[PDB]
Amino acid sequence: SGPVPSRARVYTDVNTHRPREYWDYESHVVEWGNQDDYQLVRKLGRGKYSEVFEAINITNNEKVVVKILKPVKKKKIKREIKILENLRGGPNIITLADIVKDPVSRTPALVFEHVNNTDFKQLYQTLTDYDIRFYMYEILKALDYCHSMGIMHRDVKPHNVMIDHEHRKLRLIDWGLAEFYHPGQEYNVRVASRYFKGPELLVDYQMYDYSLDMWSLGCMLASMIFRKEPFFHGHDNYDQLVRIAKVLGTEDLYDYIDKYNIELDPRFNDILGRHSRKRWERFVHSENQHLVSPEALDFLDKLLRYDHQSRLTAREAMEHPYFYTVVKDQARM
Numbered sequence: 001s002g003p004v005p006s007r008a009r010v011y012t013d014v015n016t017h018r019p020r021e022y023w024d025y026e027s028h029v030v031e032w033g034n035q036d037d038y039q040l041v042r043k044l045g046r047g048k049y050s051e052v053f054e055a056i057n058i059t060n061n062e063k064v065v066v067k068i069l070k071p072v073k074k075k076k077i078k079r080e081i082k083i084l085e086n087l088r089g090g091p092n093i094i095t096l097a098d099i100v101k102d103p104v105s106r107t108p109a110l111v112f113e114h115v116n117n118t119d120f121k122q123l124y125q126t127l128t129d130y131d132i133r134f135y136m137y138e139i140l141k142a143l144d145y146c147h148s149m150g151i152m153h154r155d156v157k158p159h160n161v162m163i164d165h166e167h168r169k170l171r172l173i174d175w176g177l178a179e180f181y182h183p184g185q186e187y188n189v190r191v192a193s194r195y196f197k198g199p200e201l202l203v204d205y206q207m208y209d210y211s212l213d214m215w216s217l218g219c220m221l222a223s224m225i226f227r228k229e230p231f232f233h234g235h236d237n238y239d240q241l242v243r244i245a246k247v248l249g250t251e252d253l254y255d256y257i258d259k260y261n262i263e264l265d266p267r268f269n270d271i272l273g274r275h276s277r278k279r280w281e282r283f284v285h286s287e288n289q290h291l292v293s294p295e296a297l298d299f300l301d302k303l304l305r306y307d308h309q310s311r312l313t314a315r316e317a318m319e320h321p322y323f324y325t326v327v328k329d330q331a332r333m
């Protein structure tokens, strides 16, 4: 018999209750602008699917970011555009400003409102306890918003969080792997960077949901409070699950595989072994102790579960005692 089906605990049917056109990105008609409205200033970064530049909008002299979409399925381009259009104006969501093609090369590019090219990975190993809580709360605002809008990011990692530390502002970027959540849909498991992949991806459980992003967020939190980059340091996708099993233990892993009737790749049969669930105290030392609290560990424990249904939702996470002082300072301001 096949895998047992799964549904999101929250925002399950939000796309069903929308007009078809909200989520039917294959049918979306893009009005392509002229990239000659912009002048590229300098190259900022190189990605698998994109080259990214600082640019000037000639018309108003406003600074922008241009992402030139490296050759890829047209379906994937419409998906990213539609998701960015749907999420435009959401809290801590990057703002799509324009969609253009190079008149010569015909290559499509996305134009975003300017953010500094200071990604979270550059800062997140140097934060105070309070700033970790503050910026985690800001990421959760973006995730609860996109989940509530029927979208899962599927590539949450430090390199996809842009931060202006001076102005205490954060944006979640690179929506190129994001998808619409539809109950009963089986998704591609070849998403996310190795160190942030949830167990559902690693065991090839395809009927996953928004909760994938909450695993990735837990991997970021563990890295930051323990000053361990990455927290789960696998050699490859098989060893990645071994790294997780040595921390979360094998008892809960095999119970998860039994619950969803998952057919575990034979490769796993000799490498997972038998491991106790480790107390988080084992990762605490003199250099990270100032970032670790009972509140931080209680919260982390409730993100890093094998069973995606067990993990906190983004809104449940925002309710956790770890954020009480952030929530109080926000109301004060």
Ligand SMILES: Brc1cc(Br)c2[nH]nnc2c1
Pocket (backbone or CB within 6 Å): 045, 050, 052, 065, 067, 094, 112, 113, 114, 115, 173, 174, 175
């Ligand atoms: Br602004 C901005 C910056 C980068 Br780097 C992005 N990668 N994908 N979308 C982006 C938007």
Ligand SMILES: [Cl-]
Pocket (backbone or CB within 6 Å): 127, 128, 129, 130, 290, 291
């Ligand atoms: Cl601190």
Ligand SMILES: [Cl-]
Pocket (backbone or CB within 6 Å): 121, 157, 158, 159, 160
């Ligand atoms: Cl990263």
Ligand SMILES: [Cl-]
Pocket (backbone or CB within 6 Å): 179, 186, 187, 188
């Ligand atoms: Cl998919």
Ligand SMILES: [Cl-]
Pocket (backbone or CB within 6 Å): 231, 232, 233, 234, 243
């Ligand atoms: Cl590890």
Ligand SMILES: [Cl-]
Pocket (backbone or CB within 6 Å): 277, 278, 279
């Ligand atoms: Cl222990």
Ligand code: NA
Pocket (backbone or CB within 6 Å): 289, 290, 291, 292, 293
């Ligand atoms: Na402590």
